[PDB]
């Protein structure tokens, strides 16, 4: 089958662990509601098998910095 992550427009998506999520929240001094949101019906979310309440680490292909890290919180539809 055609994986959703093989597209050039789709960056790598990885589910953060609990300790990784806590460290990310501590680093930026933000709550879980101050992160960008991603819908639970997103193709990347259903491909990763994530559930609402998790934080997805996105490895963007930066035109300026080469590789850039973005974080999105899974929320219900």
Partner 1 sequence: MKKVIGSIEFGILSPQEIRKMSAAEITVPDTYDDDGYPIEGGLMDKRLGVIDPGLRCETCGARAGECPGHFGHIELARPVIHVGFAKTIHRVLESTCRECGRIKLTDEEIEEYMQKFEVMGDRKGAVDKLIKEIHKKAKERMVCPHCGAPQFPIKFERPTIYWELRKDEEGNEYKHRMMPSEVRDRLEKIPDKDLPLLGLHPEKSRPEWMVLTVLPVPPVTMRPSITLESGIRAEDDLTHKLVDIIRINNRLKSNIEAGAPQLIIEDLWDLLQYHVTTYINNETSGVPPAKHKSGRPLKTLAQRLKGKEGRFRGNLSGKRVNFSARTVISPDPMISINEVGVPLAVAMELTVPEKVTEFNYEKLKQRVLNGPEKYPGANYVIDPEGRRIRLMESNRELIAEKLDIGWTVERHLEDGDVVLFNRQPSLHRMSIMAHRVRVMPYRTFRLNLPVCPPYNADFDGDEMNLHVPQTEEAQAEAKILMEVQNHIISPRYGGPLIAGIQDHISGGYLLTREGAYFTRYEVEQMLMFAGMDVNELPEPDKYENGEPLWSGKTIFSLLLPDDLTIWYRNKLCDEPERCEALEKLIEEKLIPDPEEVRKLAYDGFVYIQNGKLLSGAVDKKAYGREDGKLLDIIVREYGVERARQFLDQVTKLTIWVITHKGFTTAIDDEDLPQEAIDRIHEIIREAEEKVQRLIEAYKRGELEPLPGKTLEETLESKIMAVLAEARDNAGKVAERYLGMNNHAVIMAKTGARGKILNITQMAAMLGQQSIRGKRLYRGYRGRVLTHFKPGDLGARARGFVTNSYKSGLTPQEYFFHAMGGREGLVDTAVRTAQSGYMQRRLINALQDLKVDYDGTVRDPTGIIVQFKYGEDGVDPMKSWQGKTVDVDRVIVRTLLKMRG
Which is it for strands 12-15 and 55-62: parallel, antiparallel or unpaired?
Answer: antiparallel
Number of residues that bind partner 1 (CB under 8 A): 15
Q: Write down the least CB distance from residue 67 to partner 1, Å.
A: 9
Query: C-alpha 60: how far from its chain's center?
Result: 10
User: Would you say 33 or 41 has its CB closer to partner 1?
Assistant: 33
Residues 21-50 close enough to bind partner 1 by CB under 8 A: 28, 30-31, 33-36
5-26: b or e for each residue (b if 16 or more CB lie within 10 Å)?
A: eeeeeebebebbeeeebeebbe
Q: Does 62 bind partner 1 (CB under 8 A)?
A: yes
Do 37 and 72 contact (CB within 8 A), yes or no? yes
User: Would you say 41 or 64 has its CB closer to partner 1?
Assistant: 64
> Which spans of this chain sit near partner 1 (rule: CB under 8 A)?
28, 30-31, 33-36, 60, 62, 64-65, 68-71
């Amino acid at each position: 089958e055609f994986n959703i992550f093989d597209h050039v427009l789709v960056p790598e998506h990885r589910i953060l662990s609990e300790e990784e999520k806590e460290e990310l929240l501590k680093k930026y001094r933000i709550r879980i509601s101050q992160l960008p949101q991603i819908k639970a019906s997103d193709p990347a979310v259903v491909a990763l098998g994530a559930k609402p309440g998790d934080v997805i680490e996105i490895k963007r292909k930066s035109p300026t910095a080469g590789y850039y890290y973005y974080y999105r919180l899974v929320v219900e539809d």
